[PDB]
Amino acid sequence: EVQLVESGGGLVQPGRSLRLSCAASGFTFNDYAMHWVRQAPGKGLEWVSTISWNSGSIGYADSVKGRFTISRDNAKKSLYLQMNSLRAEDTALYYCAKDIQYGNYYYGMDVWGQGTTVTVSSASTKGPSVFPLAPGGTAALGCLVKDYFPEPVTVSWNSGALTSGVHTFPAVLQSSGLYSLSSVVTVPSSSLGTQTYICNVNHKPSNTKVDKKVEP
Amino acid sequence: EIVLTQSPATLSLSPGERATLSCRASQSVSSYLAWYQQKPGQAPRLLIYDASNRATGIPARFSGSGSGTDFTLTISSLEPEDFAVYYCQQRSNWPITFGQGTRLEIKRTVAAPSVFIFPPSDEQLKSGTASVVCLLNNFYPREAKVQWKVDNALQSGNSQESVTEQDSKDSTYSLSSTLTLSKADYEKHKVYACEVTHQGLSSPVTKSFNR
Ligand SMILES: [Zn+2]
Ligand SMILES: [Zn+2]
Ligand SMILES: [Zn+2]
């Protein structure tokens, strides 16, 4: 298989450091130029850095120069990013990506990783509060997942056995600096007396798992 | 840097129709223009490189054209898997820059939402905050007006909304609107109402509860 796998992302305070790794396998890593590209939540792609196969040529984005160092280890098929004196606006999903360029001027990033998320904030990690959105044909019920930092939170219903009719909404950043989302599912009204509904909320950054049974 | 402007920002089309996406550069990039597709939750996917060369395995319905400053991605007969965000990228000039994207959305027949209102829970009220939630379920188009009324007075500035990605089964949207008050303020009022205005609704639908 052709794979790129990044890691090292985390939550750090402004001015602190992080080192990202991008492990490649399944293609000739030493033949290709490598890139770091980042993406802020809800935003477009922004190029960070590039390194040629032989490490002899390097490029950096303007906001990044003097703070970030790209490097690679061809024998380990790995690409790195040392990120120094980090700022709030460096918060993003960070991708590594392989170029198709090979002794020519054909440019294209054809293989990408899944990304590692970097959060730069003074704000401490905080687990959610989980409140029911109780059911009032078809009924609706849900869970309000309130006041957590940082993203993400994941929600499932009935330990994964309920998926149809589920809508877990994109989080919203409240004026408090804390996130909030709702997760809902519509159900036949007839089943409300007979069927049990539990939302399983998980917030990894705070080690929070909450199961909320949602009832009339 | 070279700035790339993409238009339109959003495009609504039905499967089978032709999509025409524009990328314009602030200065010449020659042929060094690539196109990417990106779905929600997923990494970008290379479609076109050198303005007009399809990347390996990309269906023939994708074609790129242009030179200098003006470029076009054409999808000649849209498929359901083609509905995604599309970015252009130039490789002429340091730094590497991207357009801000064109979101390509499925045009569908009009569907009216079903509407639900939820009062705050008793568990939340003890903490001194009241979240009132309004749900619109499975509607098309994305455009909806959802207003809150408290004791029949239209509210302003005190709610936020959030919309799902287009549904992979029925091409509809779902939306949440959340009204936030202090417990104190919340307990001063009698009736809480969500009024929803949508193309699929002949007149506005209202859902309410009495605190
Ligand atoms: Zn639904
Ligand atoms: Zn410039
Ligand atoms: Zn198809």
Side-chain angles (χ1 to χ4, degrees):
Chain A
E1 317 208 346
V2 175
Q3 335 204 243
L4 292 175
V5 181
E6 54 289 79
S7 50
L11 167 64
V12 288
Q13 299 208 69
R16 268 83 158 287
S17 280
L18 276 175
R19 189 173 185 262
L20 314 184
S21 310
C22 162
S25 55
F27 72 97
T28 313
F29 176 89
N30 68 200
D31 282 358
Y32 305 98
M34 287 303 294
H35 299 106
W36 285 102
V37 173
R38 73 182 185 200
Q39 185 168 39
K43 310 279 173 279
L45 301 149
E46 181 185 19
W47 172 72
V48 179
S49 199
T50 306
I51 190 173
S52 65
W53 76 266
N54 55 207
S55 280
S57 189
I58 288 167
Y60 295 103
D62 230 307
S63 44
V64 137
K65 68 176 202 184
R67 292 189 302 125
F68 290 16
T69 300
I70 195 169
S71 72
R72 67 197 286 167
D73 194 325
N74 280 351
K76 288 181 189 79
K77 298 197 177 60
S78 293
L79 173 75
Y80 312 103
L81 194 75
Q82 186 59 55
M83 304 189 297
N84 294 327
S85 63
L86 283 167
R87 265 112 63 156
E89 75 256 37
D90 293 311
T91 293
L93 219 214
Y94 283 72
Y95 291 103
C96 62
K98 169 213 165 270
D99 218 87
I100 66 160
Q101 189 205 178
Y102 179 80
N104 53 22
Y105 305 126
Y106 283 166
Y107 299 105
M109 308 169 180
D110 65 335
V111 181
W112 292 71
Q114 209 151 61
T116 192
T117 116
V118 169
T119 320
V120 188
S121 176
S122 285
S124 30
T125 97
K126 184 190 199 282
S129 295
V130 181
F131 311 114
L133 301 160
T138 145
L141 58 99
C143 284
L144 176 66
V145 185
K146 223 199 175 271
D147 294 339
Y148 63 93
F149 185 81
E151 291 208 75
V153 135
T154 67
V155 191
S156 80
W157 286 90
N158 294 347
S159 289
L162 182 52
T163 59
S164 196
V166 178
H167 299 294
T168 300
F169 288 95
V172 175
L173 177 62
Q174 300 165 288
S175 88
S176 65
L178 307 166
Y179 293 98
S180 200
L181 56 77
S182 292
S183 184
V184 308
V185 59
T186 54
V187 303
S189 303
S190 63
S191 309
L192 286 173
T194 258
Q195 294 297 302
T196 290
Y197 300 101
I198 300 159
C199 70
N200 328 106
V201 182
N202 190 13
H203 185 55
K204 288 191 173 82
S206 62
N207 208 16
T208 310
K209 327 106 213 310
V210 185
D211 299 311
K212 188 65 58 165
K213 189 174 286 80
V214 180
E215 291 180 339
Chain B
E1 95 248 17
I2 302 167
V3 176
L4 308 168
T5 310
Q6 289 193 246
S7 71
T10 304
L11 188 46
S12 288
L13 295 176
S14 306
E17 293 188 298
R18 184 202 280 214
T20 291
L21 289 60
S22 179
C23 180
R24 276 152 196 156
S26 60
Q27 53 187 257
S28 179
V29 293
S30 171
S31 70
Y32 311 107
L33 199 284
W35 287 95
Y36 298 87
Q37 184 189 71
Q38 196 187 28
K39 303 177 171 164
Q42 295 191 194
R45 160 167 96 129
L46 184 67
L47 300 168
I48 300 302
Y49 67 91
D50 210 46
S52 69
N53 302 311
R54 263 181 290 140
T56 304
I58 297 298
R61 68 177 181 278
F62 295 91
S63 67
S65 60
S67 201
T69 62
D70 185 80
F71 301 89
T72 302
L73 185 65
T74 301
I75 318 168
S76 74
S77 183
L78 260 344
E79 294 278 318
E81 333 74 83
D82 298 343
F83 297 86
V85 175
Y86 290 82
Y87 295 102
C88 57
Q89 181 202 240
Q90 68 83 23
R91 304 293 300 267
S92 178
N93 184 278
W94 174 93
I96 301 180
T97 49
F98 293 86
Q100 297 313 115
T102 294
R103 190 173 163 268
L104 215 193
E105 187 233 40
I106 311 191
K107 180 183 278 188
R108 213 222 89 112
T109 67
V110 178
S114 57
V115 185
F116 306 90
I117 195 163
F118 306 93
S121 68
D122 286 324
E123 193 195 350
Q124 183 189 25
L125 283 160
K126 308 199 303 314
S127 315
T129 301
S131 304
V132 205
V133 183
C134 188
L135 172 63
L136 330 204
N137 172 254
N138 287 45
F139 61 91
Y140 187 85
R142 195 182 256 220
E143 183 201 324
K145 189 172 78 193
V146 14
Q147 304 186 302
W148 291 93
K149 267 151 194 188
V150 180
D151 293 334
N152 248 108
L154 169 62
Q155 301 293 292
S156 188
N158 56 183
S159 64
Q160 295 176 294
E161 60 184 45
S162 176
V163 191
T164 56
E165 295 296 332
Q166 196 165 210
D167 186 276
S168 83
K169 188 183 195 156
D170 68 18
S171 301
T172 62
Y173 294 96
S174 290
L175 183 140
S176 71
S177 188
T178 307
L179 180 71
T180 307
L181 313 175
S182 69
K183 164 176 162 157
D185 187 17
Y186 175 70
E187 292 181 335
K188 283 172 198 164
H189 295 276
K190 289 285 193 183
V191 33
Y192 289 80
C194 181
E195 182 189 65
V196 172
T197 307
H198 185 84
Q199 196 178 334
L201 301 172
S202 48
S203 54
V205 165
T206 300
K207 298 288 175 171
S208 57
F209 61 86
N210 303 318
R211 183 193 43 81

